[PDB]
């Protein structure tokens, strides 16, 4: 009954190593999209400003 066991769990292990390598670069590329979002935040104040006061 043994030979069925590592024919499941080895495939599970190599599938999990596949996505464990992928998710690292996923979380990497999220920070680049986050830096684009940062520049999108920063460019809201460059040329103008219209001074009011907080009420």
């Amino acid at each position: 009954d043994l030979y069925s066991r590592y024919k499941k769990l080895q495939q599970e292990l190599e599938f999990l190593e596949v996505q464990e390598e992928y998710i690292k670069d996923e979380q990497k590329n999220l920070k680049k999209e986050f830096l684009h979002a940062q520049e999108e935040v920063k460019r809201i104040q460059s040329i103008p400003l219209v001074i009011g006061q907080f009420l």
Partner: protein, 54 residues
């Protein structure tokens, strides 16, 4: 640079390239673009020609 034109509100803009920022003492009369609204040229002071008619 914090400027207030005579016609209304207050604004914050910057120089172009060569506006020589040490000239801008607080209280000088300057020029502004209509659209871009940044500073163009430092200008001499007003005369208010009610003075000139007397």
């Amino acid at each position: 640079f914090i400027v207030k034109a005579t016609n209304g509100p207050r604004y914050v803009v910057g120089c172009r390239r060569q506006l020589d920022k040490s000239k801008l003492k607080p209280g000088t009369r300057v020029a502004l673009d209509m659209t871009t609204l940044t500073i163009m040229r430092y200008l001499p002071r007003e005369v208010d020609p009610l003075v000139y008619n007397m």
